[PDB]
Design a binder for this molecule. Sequence first.
Ligand SMILES: O=C(O)c1c[nH]c2c(-c3ccccc3NCCS(=O)(=O)F)cccc2c1=O
Length: 441
Amino acid sequence: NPFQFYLTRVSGVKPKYNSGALHIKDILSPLFGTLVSSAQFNYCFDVDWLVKQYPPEFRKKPILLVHGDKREAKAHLHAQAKPYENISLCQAKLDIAFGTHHTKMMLLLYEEGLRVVIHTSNLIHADWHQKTQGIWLSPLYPRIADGTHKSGESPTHFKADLISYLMAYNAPSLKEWIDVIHKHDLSETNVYLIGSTPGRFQGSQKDNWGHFRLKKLLKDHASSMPNAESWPVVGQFSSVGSLGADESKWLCSEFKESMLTLGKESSSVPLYLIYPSVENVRTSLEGYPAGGSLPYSIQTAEKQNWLHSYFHKWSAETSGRSNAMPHIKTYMRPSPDFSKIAWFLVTSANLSKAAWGALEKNGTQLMIRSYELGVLFLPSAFGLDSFKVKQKFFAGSQEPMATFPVPYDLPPELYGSKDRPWIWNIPYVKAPDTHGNMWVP
Ligand SMILES: O=C(O)c1c[nH]c2c(-c3ccccc3NCCS(=O)(=O)F)cccc2c1=O
């Protein structure tokens, strides 16, 4: 298949729902390449666990951990890595308040080439155990021959764009990886990179990052169809930021306006937001503890009750994952009957201004607080006008090259009147979870 979009393995589903899924041990296996060194970009790390996920023969190859921790949290991570002499750390600068290093990416340097993995899981056991998580696997990129001068660039500009993303860190350990990427041929890449990095972007940089980056790609590389106003927008996420007192402050002004862009010409577009209900969490494989990774606070939620009328339940019968709570984040543009999509994005970015950017300075500046990363699937990059939705995520469609594996059910189902969004810091003591327990923060 051309998309190379995978879900993580889920412990407890029937084998048919894990055949074609990937565990971290599979990604790092020698079958994927003979590891020379690796970089692990992430938010949360269990270093003892992480090293055990590498094949025994590769466990002493250099590993770089790229994180955003400061002060005591940084000291704790260094203490975790101190027993492993082969592990180096890079502290990503976070010079804007309330920003985080959320990007989840593996750079895997092999004797045979280079692989890039952009995904949604933290490097801890629970994120790969019973959650719905997403993975994009790059091709094996060959090394450009010494003395040969070629760009190694793809029609999606992925090589330059990935280098640009890494350059924003201004970090010596990542300049080393930039030099590795320069030496490899990434021309087969058929996805577009969408990153966020912290800063305040104007002018020639406004379109580099966040939702303006998405808007620019959709303007340049998608086409607007008749009745485009009837094609919904779907956003699916595991956390929600403070979006403002009403939908006009950010969600339906600048964020939705970027997401509904198609083509270069100049709204009643339906907006579906998918986020687990309390009942989704209670009846999940993990039970209420799944809500530890759905960090929507009551303090934030009570300021924006208008938002919850957009919320739809998590349902994933198509991938056998209705009870595997989502930590994947995805955004896409389905047709009015949900049979086709105009594009699909898998990313680390939750539904927040910190992740996607917020306009400042009278609309002239995009301010982003965090590091985020995702990849965008556009039909034009595959020689197509749209993607047909795969009916069963792991099934065998009539042509894999035209048929995109959407990991949850369409159409999304609106919350019922008794449903509530999962809010992690209030108690749930009316009905026990799948392990027999209540939730008492
Ligand atoms: O990147 C990701 O996917 C994630 C990012 N944040 C969280 C949080 C969280 C949110 C606000 C402030 C601190 C948090 N947690 C401290 C962890 S740490 O300092 O040890 F790294 C809580 C539950 C899950 C996630 C998560 O899954």
